Amino acid sequence: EAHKREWNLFYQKQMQLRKGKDPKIEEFVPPDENCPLKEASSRRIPRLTVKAREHCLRLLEEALSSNRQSTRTADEADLRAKAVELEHETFRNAKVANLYKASVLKKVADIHRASKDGQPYDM
Amino acid sequence: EHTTLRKVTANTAIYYDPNPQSTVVAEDQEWVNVYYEMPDFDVARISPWLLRVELDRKHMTDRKLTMEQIAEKINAGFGDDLNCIFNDDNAEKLVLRIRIMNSDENKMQEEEEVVDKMDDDVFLRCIESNMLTDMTLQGIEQIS
């Protein structure tokens, strides 16, 4: 109990020395003109820039395209909407940036596994 | 039943990794690149020293623990200023790479700040000891 509090204060003071002077740099960037991301302008996930969210959506898009060429469904028009839906589901289910990214790559890996097995990625 | 990180850790090492795209450990280079290519992630402030934790799969599965849960507990206990990255659950081994995210951006000749800074090697060792002893991944303390 006392050791836990001592460690907490000690760790906070140690990691404050690595912040030091000018601890401002927030500079949140609002989304660009044509961000294809549901709930683009949000701050639910700290330290998650909009560009990283777009990057994760883009990775989901390549995963969906690979699944398409490995399944041969109707067309790729719905791929973009499906990728946005999956990205929004990942964003909702995640709370911080790194675990959100990990969930994104887990979804990509699941899509790749479905493509290897030959089955389309269901909702 | 109390379960700290030690009960689910196969091993733990501290490396000097100045360049995450270099990744002196060869096995992780496949899945570390997909983490440092994100626009929000920059190698400018990542700290060179890296704490690599290899998790025992049998002990992890006996408790139905996921690397997602371990990372969530790390974020809760140590804040969002300690970078944590982990592999895929289907990989051959469970790897957890942790770095001390130094939020300073200037770093211009410092300000003679070497008084109690504790260069990240020994600080990472202390963080590792705290993570292995007082992390409470699962269960209630005083129950074994």
Author numbering:
A (entry chain U): 498 to 620
B (entry chain A): 1162 to 1305
The authors write:
We focused first on the IRI module interactions. This approach greatly improved the map’s local resolution at the IRI–Pol II interface, enabling us to trace the polypeptide chain. Several residues in α3 (N595, K598, and R610) participate in hydrogen bonding or ionic interactions with residues in RPB1. Our structure further shows that the αN helix binds to a shallow nonpolar groove in the top face of the RPB1 lower jaw.
RECQL5 is a regulator of transcription elongation known to interact directly with Pol II, thereby playing important roles in suppressing genome instability. The RECQL5 IRI module, encompassing the αN helix and KIX domain, wraps around the surface of the RPB1 lower jaw with exquisite molecular complementarity, serving as an anchor point of RECQL5 on Pol II.
